[PDB]
């Protein structure tokens, strides 16, 4: 179907919005993969088996790798889920993830 392509172009615009700089203050921890070495996190990969970040999603989107909007949404939500599973809920990163996720969920809910 053609409408799948229209949905994916809406998804690409949503990805560009999540990378926009109105959100920089809370989006920056999600720009790049977690660098466990820079952060001192010897236990991250024990909890998080499938790392995800917006930069990886952008390269996947630039390569036509998402065949429907629902695969894209699953990668974005995976990124958040990794953050929420690894970190305690009172952690700043979780508030920041929720602000970015609110942006995502509001925009994704409009796709037909
Ligand atoms: C892209 C910006 O790099 C970061 C820098 C710093 C920082 O100030 N440094 C560390 C580097 C140190 N120098 C410089 C290099 N040299 C090697 C060593 C010395 C100097 C001091 C902190 C977090 C960063 N980036 C991040 N990326 C995902 C996550 C993430 N931080 N948070 C933090 C986000 C903001 C609050 C906490 C997490 C922290 C622990 C566990 C999980 C997560 C998590 O879930 N995510 C998604």
- One DSSP character per residue, 58-87 reads HHHHHTT--SSHHHHHHHHHHHHHHHHHHS
Who lines ligand 1 at CB under 6 A?
Answer: 29, 32, 34, 38-39, 41, 83, 86-87, 92-93
User: Residue 98 CA to chain centroid, in angstroms?
Assistant: 11
Q: Going by CA atoms, what residue is nearest to atom 8 of ligand 1?
A: 39
CA of 27 to the centre of ligand 1 (A): 13
Resolution (A): 2.8
Query: Is residue 51 within a helix (H) or strand (E), and if so which, with residue range?
Result: none
Residue 112 gets which letter from DSSP? Answer: -
């Amino acid at each position: 179907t053609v409408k799948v392509t229209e949905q994916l172009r809406h998804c690409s615009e949503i990805l560009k919005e999540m990378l926009a700089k109105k959100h920089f203050s809370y989006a920056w921890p999600f720009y790049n993969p977690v660098d466990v070495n820079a952060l001192g996190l010897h236990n991250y990969y024990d909890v998080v088996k499938n790392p995800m970040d917006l930069g990886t999603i952008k390269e996947k989107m630039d390569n036509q790798e998402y065949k429907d909007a629902y695969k894209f949404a699953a990668d974005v939500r995976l990124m958040f889920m990794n953050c929420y599973k690894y970190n305690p809920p009172d952690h700043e990163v979780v508030t920041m993830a929720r602000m970015l996720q609110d942006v995502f969920e509001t925009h994704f809910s409009k796709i037909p």
